[PDB]
Amino acid sequence: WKVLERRARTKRSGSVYEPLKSINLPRPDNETLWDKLDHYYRIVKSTLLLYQSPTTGLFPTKTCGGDQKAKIQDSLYCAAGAWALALAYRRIDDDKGRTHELEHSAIKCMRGILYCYMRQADKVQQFKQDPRPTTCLHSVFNVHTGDELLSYEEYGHLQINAVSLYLLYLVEMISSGLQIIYNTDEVSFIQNLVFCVERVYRVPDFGVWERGSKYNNGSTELHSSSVGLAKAALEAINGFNLFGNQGCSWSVIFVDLDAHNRNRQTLCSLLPRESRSHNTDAALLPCISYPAFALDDEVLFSQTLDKVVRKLKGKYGFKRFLRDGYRTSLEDPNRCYYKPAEIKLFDGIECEFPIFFLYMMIDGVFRGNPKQVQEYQDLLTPVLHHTTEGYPVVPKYYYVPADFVEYEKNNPGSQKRFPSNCGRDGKLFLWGQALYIIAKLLADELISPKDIDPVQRYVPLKDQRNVSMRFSNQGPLENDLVVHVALIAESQRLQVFLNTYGIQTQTPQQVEPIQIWPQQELVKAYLQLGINEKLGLSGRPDRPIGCLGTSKIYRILGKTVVCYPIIFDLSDFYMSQDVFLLIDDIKNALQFIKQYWKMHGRPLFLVLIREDNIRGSRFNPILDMLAALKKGIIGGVKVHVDRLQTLISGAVVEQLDFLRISDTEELPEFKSFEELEPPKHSKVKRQSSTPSAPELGQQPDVNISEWKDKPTHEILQKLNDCSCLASQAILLGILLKREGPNFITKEGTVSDHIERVYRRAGSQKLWLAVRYGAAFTQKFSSSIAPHITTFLVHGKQVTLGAFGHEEEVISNPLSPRVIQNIIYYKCNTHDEREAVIQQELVIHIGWIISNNPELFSGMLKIRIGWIIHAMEYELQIRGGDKPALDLYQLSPSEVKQLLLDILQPQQNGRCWLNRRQIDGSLNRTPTGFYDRVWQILERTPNGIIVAGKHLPQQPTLSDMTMYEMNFSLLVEDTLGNIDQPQYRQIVVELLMVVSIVLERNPELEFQDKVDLDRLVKEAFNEFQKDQSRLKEIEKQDDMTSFYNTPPLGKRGTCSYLTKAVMNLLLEGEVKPNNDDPCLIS
């Protein structure tokens, strides 16, 4: 180093002035880099490249026995190791023709994988429409001919992780510089593979281990690792050029922002766990380490790493997950599926994979923590094995001998384990040796982390500043986005009317160079993208485009294209007839855009103004909203308004050149937004608001309960001579139900009549008649399905049905036809207005949970009918002595308002009965309730019986864990049998009392199974006796007075509950704990 290098003080000591260079510096141990690189090349050639089929380049999973099956992930990791070795050897000009061989080996492995995938194009086409395990791509192929080997009835073949990892490695290799994609058909196949991956957030997958779940009963579930890998692959290929440097604008790939946003939303919530049944799993390590690096938070990453280290770490390796029976001593090698309570036998004898030490070493060197690197290297040295020539071998796993299983269970880690079958000379683990080569190369500084990461998957904490779809310019801890807003006027008269009130607006005629398009034309244009007649390709499926996709600017056929949000278009429902709902939806869209925008450049928001939404008394809210937008901040979001031509200038534009390359003889025609010419009959030049009052009020005198058996001519003449809109709607609905929709009435067909009366009721703001007509016409909203998908993403279950009757649960996302069938064929016995109110509630709750998820913390499932009963009771209480008005005429604005007041965290004031009713209806439980229930079940033998439903203790304890969401689902299912919300609240309070009593008093235990009904009855009897003694009041049935009691203070319900539970506990045996020094007690 410095000072020691010069040593040129010939005469005593003095200042020296001569070149020193660095070649003269002392060198490390005398060994040329060529020698080490040749040693690594020999190790690779004798272990990894020696097993590769020349026909396809797929690495066999088994090195002996003539096995024909070959996995995809093993081949991908072998190709990655070969590419890393090629990068290492690139550092020498005189490579003696070795770098080319390694880069070709990687290319050939990738080409074999691509050929095997492309042999199944109809499978990709089917998976695009209905992704199911039956119609998914195979995961194992023949190693000699590239043919399918295992059917769907023995392997499932549902693994999206392999496709995501293959896509990510292809992106990385192409960015680093390689030639793997040759023709345009390969580009189209990659595009359709991206499309198939794009909907990973809904279809469950069998996982990396192919077992499917911890129970291994042929069941699939969502996995965090798969979602993370798919999301990382989506970010990596966003706008990537598949042809490398020698590429043009027509060789680019495209992804939409909505799917990536949904994947991020689904990942950022299930991240601390692995799945519903897996609290912790070692397959999450690749999701947050070298290949993926899909967790850009640095806090959940640290927490998950600490949890994994605390749980799965072992001396011989890392266990895959708790209570697994892969190749264990107690496993039975004659059955593919396990049995209930059998999994418990696999505790303490879990196999350990040494490859996770390698993985943690790789993560450490990538992060820059050499302490962890040397610690894991030291732990890895004793477990490694050597061949005859001395080449190191990484055993697949380590299993305890069958004779020592009892000793291992008694003292975990005390016994010694034996190496796996592929842990000695003769049988090799290509995946393990590839990862060993990669990690040893990285540790020895033979490859810089940038060399194997050209796309920059890993970013340091100081550089998380400018990454597309990952970070904003502010950073990861700030959100002050400014949204560009441009106002558009329907017509010139509308522009003049807005100008007269201090609002500046532009018309489409004034932006001639810029064309405005709706969502349909953009969807059609994206449909034409993936067309390949040679193989058969349908392109992007016909799906709507979200707010993120409509915030960009596209250049199609040399013309600038801007698309307004889907909120501004109405098709069939009456929710768009309220201006307040439109303003609320616009504010919600603005908040969603601000919160979930990570691209480069300010997003573009287009506002469409129509003459039909300003007429009457609704002019004032529109003017208020427009003034707020012009001010600069609306709904807590800063916005900027200016001319569209100025906005589009200097901005980043999106290019769609696939249309030019299309071979269609006639180019499709897209219809842009056109200005509406003024009428030449009435010439309404945007007159004043003119509130007036041309409305009346009458309650309908006709109900379905009486006008049912009346014959045809009487109801016909009654409809003819009546004037009530609601009565007319009811009569027409009865006619449709009985007589038929095709019957010709006095004013035409029944269908035309109901449509006309619905339209006039909507124009005149008659909500009762509108809802009656919508219910009887069986109308449906296209926004129901995306709302339900968002609901199921956030981990909240949904039940559809009337209060206190049959309900249908939706465990997994369903097609719109199925949910429409469910909502329209499970409430026949009730009025059809319930379906409409349920749709309205679903839409509103979806919007608020998308914007304010904190309002619904603490509830696992949402019951629509119970919420209906909740706001019905709320309005009944609000009415006081005066009876409540209705529930189907307050309009969606007041419906949403009442829902907001209901969803408030606390409603102190009115007596406790209303609070308990609201709490029970909303199905709200205090935090940690499931943990207390699990503790009680652990300390209570023979289970618990509630409302007939019984919860056993043996299988739940044998299979399930403390923090498993499956236990929470089972507890909710058991407790949902309660019909009275007050009874459910009392049950919850009694459960909490039992939990606190048991925790505070470990000695007492329950002798037998507990029954909640008996405890509740005893508490009620004690309260009744106390009230009779205190106030001389005769005993009265029903608990109307018991619920009003506060749950703390003087003679509260808590006192009776704790007295009852203590009386039950002291009936049984009391076991003294010898640890406590309390004696004679």
């Binding site: 009130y501 932006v511 160079p513 040399g558 100025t646 200038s649 534009v653």
Partner: protein, 617 residues
């Protein structure tokens, strides 16, 4: 593509014609011939073709060559405008000194030199007073700034622009040398008012009402405020000053530049058609239109190497005046812009014959056509019968640039909405109606009680704490501190009286809404405010004036306080005239305006509010 071929052809023509004299370092082209001098108006008009070609090229994006060409054109026009802007900065002292006491010996020199941006002619050897050039410069700078181009770069630049706008705002009551720099028909060192000048100034003021010079990224501190009274006064002067050219000129072809595509500073389309018909009848010829009657420019007589023509033009310059095809190009632009197609075709066919070929067969527009000295009596006896020959600057970049722009517009490669992002084409659209709002205020509790006794519900000066009422002298003093900077020795806008069109507008200062009474109720200034009948009559007149034009955005608001000097002899009731006026106010009709009496808070919901960023501490 054929469109690309035509575009590169037009680029070649413009490069070989105008862009060949780009004059780097500074960016100001010479004014043709061996002049070595740069004219602001000539350069601004010449750069229009380059700007239009750049705008056309910008549309065909997604290619490196087209993007580079568009960037080069935009940067070239930006460099030219920056050079002219520096030339204008080189006379900040002259501008500041002109701001007070308007005089011909104070304005910036219209003739500017070549590179090194110096002065080429003193203050007495030329007419250095041309408001039209500065106004058209401001208008075009505003149009390109609205387009998306960046020209203004510093806050001091904004201050200089504001000061120069204040300097040009007084064009409606000053006499300049006009576009021809010769005053009236006889030079004689006399200047007179010109319709072109005031029209250009009004258009520049209107186009620069609120726009931000910094684009979208600019803030409230980079906006420029212009008064409403000046624009309306200029428009009124134009309306009363367009049956002819000027006070001495019966007709001038320069009026075409006011009633057509350049600045669109005209209304009453019937008057526009009448002016066009008069110009056609009195000026059209076989080789373009003449400037004006009795002009002696470039004639074979009157001693060409002389100035200060003596009054001896009884018939010497009559019927032999030269004709300029640039008026034909202006007619082509006017026809191709608004709604005309056949007129454009016929004018293009007429103009194609008068064109003279150049090197490599490039079209060139001659400056003018002059009558031969031999065939002069024949032209006298037989007007428009003899044949003229092309004289003047053969590569006239002015007419050539306008012709190129017109050809580009007619070919369809460019749209009328591209050159005019401010939407000035609809300036002739009639205004349907405007509703003025009035607010009635009580000075004291006794006045409010008396009004309540008479069935009138009003509010006192108190109880409206969020709003403040002050005389217009306060806003006058406040606006006098606009565009004030000590470094470049700028004194800001000079103190001046304030009309009624801006006092009605609401103002926001320090996050507080400020409402000001009209200046005519100031009894301290002058004693006409004492008389009841005069007050009600001129209040009706002012209401009528406000209801007539109201060119600004939003609804108006008038505050009328009731003083104690207006009471009867006993001091117990209001005067009959004021009571009758207020009763007419309550009925929603007074004079020729529609009013709706109400509260100030109600009017605050919808009105024109202006925020003064320069008053922030």
């Amino acid at each position: 593509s054929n469109s690309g071929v035509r575009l590169d052809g037009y680029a070649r023509l413009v490069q070989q014609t105008i862009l060949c004299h780009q004059n780097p370092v500074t960016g100001l082209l010479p004014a043709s011939y061996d002049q070595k001098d740069a004219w602001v108006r000539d350069n601004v008009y010449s750069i229009l073709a380059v700007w239009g070609l750049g705008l056309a090229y910008r549309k065909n994006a997604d290619r490196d060559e087209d993007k580079a060409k568009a960037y080069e054109l935009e940067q070239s026009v930006v460099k030219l405008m920056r050079g002219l802007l520096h030339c204008m900065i080189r006379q900040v002292d002259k501008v500041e000194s002109f701001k007070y006491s308007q005089s011909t010996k104070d304005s910036l020199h219209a003739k500017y030199n070549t590179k090194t941006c110096a002065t080429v002619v003193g203050d007495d050897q030329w007419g250095h007073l041309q408001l039209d050039a500065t106004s058209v410069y401001l208008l075009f700078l505003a149009q390109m700034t609205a387009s998306g181009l960046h020209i203004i770069h510093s806050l001091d630049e904004v201050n200089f622009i504001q000061n120069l706008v204040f300097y040009i705002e007084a064009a409606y009551k000053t006499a300049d040398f006009g576009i021809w720099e010769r005053g009236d028909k006889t030079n004689q060192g006399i200047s007179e008012l010109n319709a072109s000048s005031v029209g250009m100034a009004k258009a520049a003021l209107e186009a620069l009402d609120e726009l931000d010079l910094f684009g979208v990224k600019g803030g409230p501190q980079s906006v420029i405020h212009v008064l409403a009274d000046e624009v309306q006064h200029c428009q009124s002067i134009l309306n009363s000053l367009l049956p002819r050219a000027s006070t001495s000129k019966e007709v001038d072809a320069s009026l075409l530049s006011v009633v057509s595509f350049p600045a669109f500073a005209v209304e009453d389309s019937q008057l526009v058609e009448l002016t066009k018909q008069e110009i056609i009848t009195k000026l059209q010829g076989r080789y373009g239109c003449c400037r004006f009657l009795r002009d002696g420019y470039k004639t074979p007589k009157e001693d060409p190497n002389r100035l200060y023509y003596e009054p001896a033009e009884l018939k010497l310059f009559e019927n032999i005046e030269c004709e300029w095809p640039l008026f034909w190009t202006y007619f082509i632009l006017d026809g191709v812009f608004s709604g005309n197609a056949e007129q454009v075709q016929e004018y293009k066919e007429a103009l194609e014959a008068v064109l003279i070929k150049g090197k490599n067969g490039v079209p060139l527009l001659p400056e003018l056509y002059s009558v031969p000295p031999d065939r002069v009596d024949e032209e006298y006896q037989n007007p428009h019968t003899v044949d003229r020959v092309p004289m003047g600057k053969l590569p006239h970049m002015w007419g050539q640039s306008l012709y190129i722009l017109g050809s580009l517009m007619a070919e369809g490669f460019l749209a009328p909405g591209e050159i005019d992002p401010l939407n000035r084409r609809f300036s002739t659209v009639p205004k349907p109606d405007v509703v003025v709002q009035v607010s009635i205020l009580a000075e004291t509790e006794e006045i409010k009680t008396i009004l309540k006794d008479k069935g009138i519900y009003v509010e006192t000066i108190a109880e409206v704490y969020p709003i403040r009422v002050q005389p217009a002298r306060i806003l006058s003093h406040i606006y006098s501190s606009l565009g004030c900077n000590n470094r470049m020795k700028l004194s800001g806008r000079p103190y001046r009286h304030m009309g009624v069109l801006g006092t009605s507008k609401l103002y926001d200062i320090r996050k507080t809404i400020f409402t000001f009474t009209p200046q005519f109720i100031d009894q301290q200034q002058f004693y006409l405010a004492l008389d009841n009948k005069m007050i009600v009559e001129m209040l009706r007149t002012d209401l009528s004036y406000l209801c007539s034009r109201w060119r600004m955005t939003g609804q108006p608001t008038i505050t009328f306080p009731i003083s104690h000097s207006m009471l009867d002899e006993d001091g117990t009731s209001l005067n009959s005239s004021i009571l009758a006026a207020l009763r007419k106010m309550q009925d929603g009709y007074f004079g020729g305006a529609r009013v709706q009496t109400g509260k100030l808070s109600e009017f605050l919901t919808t009105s024109c509010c202006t925020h003064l960023s320069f008053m922030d501490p």
